[PDB]
Each structure stands twice: as structure tokens, then as C-alpha cells.
Design an enzyme around this catalytic site. Structure first.
Site, PDB file in Angstrom:
ATOM      1  CG  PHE A 147      15.569  26.122  -2.199  1.00 28.33           C
ATOM      2  CD1 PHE A 147      15.673  24.780  -2.545  1.00 28.33           C
ATOM      3  CD2 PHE A 147      16.503  27.019  -2.709  1.00 28.33           C
ATOM      4  CE1 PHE A 147      16.649  24.345  -3.430  1.00 28.33           C
ATOM      5  CE2 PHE A 147      17.488  26.594  -3.594  1.00 28.33           C
ATOM      6  CZ  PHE A 147      17.563  25.248  -3.952  1.00 28.33           C
ATOM      7  CB  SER A 199       1.895  26.290   9.533  1.00 30.81           C
ATOM      8  OG  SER A 199       1.360  24.976   9.500  1.00 30.81           O
ATOM      9  CG  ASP A 245      11.635  16.881  -8.262  1.00 29.41           C
ATOM     10  OD1 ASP A 245      11.319  18.099  -8.267  1.00 29.41           O
ATOM     11  OD2 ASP A 245      10.813  15.990  -8.562  1.00 29.41           O
ATOM     12  CD  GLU A 276      16.530  20.579  -2.304  1.00 30.53           C
ATOM     13  OE1 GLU A 276      15.540  21.198  -1.865  1.00 30.53           O
ATOM     14  OE2 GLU A 276      16.423  19.607  -3.090  1.00 30.53           O
ATOM     15  CG  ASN A 278      -0.939  23.574  11.778  1.00 28.39           C
ATOM     16  OD1 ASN A 278      -0.626  24.233  10.787  1.00 28.39           O
ATOM     17  ND2 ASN A 278      -2.186  23.168  12.008  1.00 28.39           N
ATOM     18  CG  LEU A 307      11.245  22.466 -10.959  1.00 25.91           C
ATOM     19  CD1 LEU A 307      11.151  20.957 -11.100  1.00 25.91           C
ATOM     20  CD2 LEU A 307       9.988  23.035 -10.318  1.00 25.91           C
TER      21      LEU A 307
END
Length: 162
Positions: free
Chosen positions: A104, A117, A20, A11, A132, A32
């Protein structure tokens, strides 16, 4: 390596409001603020989050505080979610970090929707899960980061972050 260092790598750290990868106002270590196009709205979210009238700029300590809260929130979201919790519980420590990383980035609801998945991960079919996972908007929009997270799920090691 640990989930905090992993997410710091993925990040980065910026102390002024920025946009972002999706064009959304953000600050700190991937915090965010809002999906609103209004910078004023983003600044209001920031002030509310920090507890003071900011100039759209925060300190490193403040960024790190939001980060602690956001990692905590991702784990809490996993554990309260009926789809994510059994997968998390089924995983080793390294792959647990990979799942926290996904939550996250995309949120609890988003990751909980990766039904096939998640099933492959719970089955410990790691190469199949990896294949996948890459069949996703997530992978296409952030492929280098998704590749690291997927390698972590595939191998159960930190090789993609070392």
C-alpha cells in the site's frame, strides 16, 4: 485489529489535497494522486478518481471508497506478482497484513524488490527479517511506521498497533 484499521492508523484521514511524506499530492487515507509537482495535475487525477469536478476536497465516504479500492489493489498486486505471491501465501493472517501495508505504501514493484527480506520472511527467520527490513530507504524515511510494520512481521501480533 485488521488491515483497514492498521492502515488507517498509519495513513490518517485528510479530506483536502495535501502532500505526503515524499512531497507528493495525496488525499483521503494515503491515496496518492500523482508524483507531478503540478497541483492542477493532482486535481485532475482526483476528479478522474472520484468521477466528478471536485474543489480539491472530497467527503469521508469518497475517501473511504478510494481506500477500499487501494487496499483491494494492494492485495491484487501481491497476488499477481511472482515474487510477492509465494511470500504472502507462506504467511499467517497478521503478517499478511504487514505485507499488504508495505505494498500500500510503496507499491507492488517496490516491495517485490526486497529480495533478501522476502526470503527471510519465507524462511520464517523473523528476527533476521526484521533486521534486514530496517536496512532500507523505507525505514530511514518513515521509521516510526516502518518500526510498527517490522514489529508485526517480527512477532505475528498487533502489539505495535494496540
Amino acid at each position: 485489529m485488521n488491515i483497514f484499521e492498521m492502515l488507517r492508523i498509519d495513513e490518517g484521514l485528510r479530506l483536502k489535497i495535501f502532500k505526503d511524506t515524499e512531497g507528493y499530492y495525496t488525499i483521503g487515507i494515503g491515496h496518492l494522486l500523482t508524483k507531478s509537482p503540478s497541483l492542477n495535475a493532482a486535481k485532475s487525477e482526483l476528479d478522474k478518481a472520484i468521477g466528478r469536478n471536485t474543489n480539491g476536497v472530497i467527503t469521508k465516504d469518497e475517501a473511504e471508497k478510494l481506500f477500499n479500492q487501494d487496499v483491494d489493489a494492494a492485495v491484487r498486486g501481491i497476488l499477481r506478482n511472482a515474487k510477492l505471491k509465494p511470500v504472502y501465501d507462506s504467511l499467517d493472517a497478521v503478517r499478511r497484513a504487514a505485507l499488504i501495508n508495505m505494498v500500500f505504501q510503496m507499491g507492488e514493484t517496490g516491495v517485490a524488490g526486497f529480495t533478501n527480506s522476502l526470503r527471510m520472511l519465507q524462511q520464517k527467520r523473523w528476527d533476521e527479517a526484521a533486521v534486514n527490513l530496517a536496512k532500507s530507504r523505507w525505514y530511514n524515511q518513515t521509521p516510526n511506521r516502518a518500526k510498527r510494520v517490522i514489529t508485526t512481521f517480527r512477532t505475528g501480533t498487533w502489539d505495535a498497533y494496540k
